[PDB]
Amino acid sequence: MRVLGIETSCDETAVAVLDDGKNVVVNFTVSQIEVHQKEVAARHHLKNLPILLKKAFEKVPPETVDVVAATYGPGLIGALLVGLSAAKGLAISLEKPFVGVNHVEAHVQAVFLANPDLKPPLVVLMVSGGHTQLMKVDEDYSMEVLGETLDDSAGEAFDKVARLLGLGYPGGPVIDRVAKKGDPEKYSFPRPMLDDDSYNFSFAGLKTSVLYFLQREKGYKVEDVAASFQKAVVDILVEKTFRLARNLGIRKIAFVGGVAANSMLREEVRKRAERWNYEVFFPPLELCTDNALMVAKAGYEKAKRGMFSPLSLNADPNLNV
């Protein structure tokens, strides 16, 4: 069952063809049409995608495609309406079905890929820049937003508190890197909405707390501030994921997103799982968990269950689970 999957949600404009959601037949991505061709520009979907269909149908014969998948949310109306509007019209001219991918649904999925034999009663925390969130994944694979930031992503907190500290890009790597030298129990920074009946986060609390210190104070070590603040983010995260994995009753726990990558998260999460006896999960090494392979897979499993979308389907840029 060849799914032809199309990406117009991320900044790499991607087209992929994936037999049976496993064996990948061709992967073309504009990103890899620059040093393998060393114009066609960053994320100019409507200009790029055409060339990638050109590149795809030169190799894959047109017939063979069985489903056309393509993300419809979340992303930007303009971006989404190019992969989606284009995939709809493939469907028409292939006389094949089309599947709208919910991206954050698909994101959550590849967890079930990073271990084939991983059983699906499970709680995901998604800590990106765009997204901060706790979810249920029911044994049937039914998800719900239970926890959601009300202001800022953990990703955004990290990137700006980095900026405030005269540290480089990217936000987190730099703060992770340089807190290694510091004292995370050095400044008693606030942990907004902890010890609560809510499963929700706020972070703009922190960004300001740090900024107010940086202004008022002086003589301070940068590491020490960087360590102090990373712990206050990790305390609020690590508490909620495990307060809720208990409160409902789950032992296997998934960590998706960029903030995922944090050495002090992975170390603190680990001394909780190694001590209540819980199975703890992370994504792959070269995190590009965002190709067209993603949405091909997504749309395979969808079509597998004859869950197709109609040619009326509009983009939803605010789409969640």
Partner 1 sequence: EEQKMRHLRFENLTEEQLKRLAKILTENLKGGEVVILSGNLGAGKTTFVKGMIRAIGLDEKMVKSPTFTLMNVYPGLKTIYHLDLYRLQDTDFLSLDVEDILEDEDGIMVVEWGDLFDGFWPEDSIKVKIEIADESHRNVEILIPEEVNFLVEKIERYRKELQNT
Partner 2 sequence: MNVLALDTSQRIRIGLRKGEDLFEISYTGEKKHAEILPVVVKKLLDELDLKVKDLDVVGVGIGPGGLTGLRVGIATVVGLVSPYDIPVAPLNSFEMTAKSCPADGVVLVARRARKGYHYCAVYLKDKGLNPLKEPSVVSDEELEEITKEFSPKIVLKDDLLISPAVLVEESERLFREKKTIHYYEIEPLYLQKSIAELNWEKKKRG
- Rounded-to-integer distance, Cα 255 and Cα 251, Å: 13
| Backbone CA torsion sign across 125, 131, 136, 139 | negative
Instruction: Give dist(CA 226, CA 294) in Å, integer.
Output: 34
Q: What is the CA radius of gyration of the chain?
A: 21
Both tokens of 91, joined, read 């469907």
* 107 annotated to bind ligand: yes
Q: Which of 22, 34, 59, 62 binds partner 2 (CB under 8 A)?
A: 62
User: With contact defined as beta carbons under 8 Å apart, do 98 and 87 qualify?
Assistant: yes
DSSP strand pairing (122-127 vs 132-137): antiparallel
Q: Can residue 103 be called a binding residue for Zn ion (CB under 5 A)? A: yes
Q: Is 128 annotated as a binding residue?
A: yes
Q: How far is the CB of 109 from partner 2 (least distance, A)?
A: 24
Q: Tokens in use for 44?
A: 């100019």
The label of the residue with tokens 């508490």 reads: 239
Long-range CB pairs of 204-212 (<8 Å, 24+ gap) are 204/151, 204/152, 204/157, 206/157, 206/161, 206/232, 206/233, 207/152, 207/156, 207/157, 207/160, 207/161, 207/164, 210/161, 210/164, 210/165, 211/164
Q: Which of residues 209-248 bind partner 1 (CB under 8 A)?
A: 211-212
Q: Is 50 in the site for ligand TXA (CB under 6 A)?
A: no
DSSP codes joined into one string, 210-267? HHHHHHH--S--HHHHHHHHHHHHHHHHHHHHHHHIIIII-SEEEEESSGGG-HHHHH
- The structure tokens 């709809």 sit at 88
**3-state DSSP assignment of residue 67:** strand
Provide the minimum distance between the beta carbon of 250 and ligand TXA in the complex, in angstroms, as a whole number: 22
258 is in an annotated binding site: no
Q: How far is the CB of 138 from partner 2 (least distance, A)?
A: 31
The nearer residue to partner 2, 50 or 121, going by C-beta atoms, is 50
Residues in contact with partner 2, shown as a per-residue x/- string from 64 to 83 under the rule CB under 8 A: -x-----------xx--xxx
Segment 172 to 211, residues that bind partner 1, using CB under 8 A: 204, 207-208, 211
Q: Which of 160, 191, 231, 297 binds ligand APC (CB under 6 A)?
A: 160
Instruction: Verify binding: residue 240, Zn ion, rule CB under 5 A.
Output: no
Which residue in 173, 190, 192, 317 binds ligand TXA (CB under 6 A)? 173
Residue with tokens 């055409």: 50
Given partner 2, partner 1, Zn ion, none, residue 107, with its beta carbon under 5 to 8 Å by kind, binds Zn ion
Quick note: the x/- pattern for Zn ion over 288-307, rule CB under 5 A, is: -x------------------
**Annotation: binding site:** 103, 107, 126-130, 159, 172, 176, 262, 290
By CB under 6 A, name the binding residues for ligand APC.
151, 160, 204-205, 208
By CB under 6 A, name the binding residues for ligand TXA.
10, 104, 107, 128-131, 155, 158-159, 170-173, 176, 257-259, 261-262, 287, 289
By CB under 8 A, name the binding residues for partner 2.
46-47, 49-51, 53-54, 57, 62, 65, 77-78, 81-95, 310-315
By CB under 5 A, name the binding residues for Zn ion.
103, 107, 289
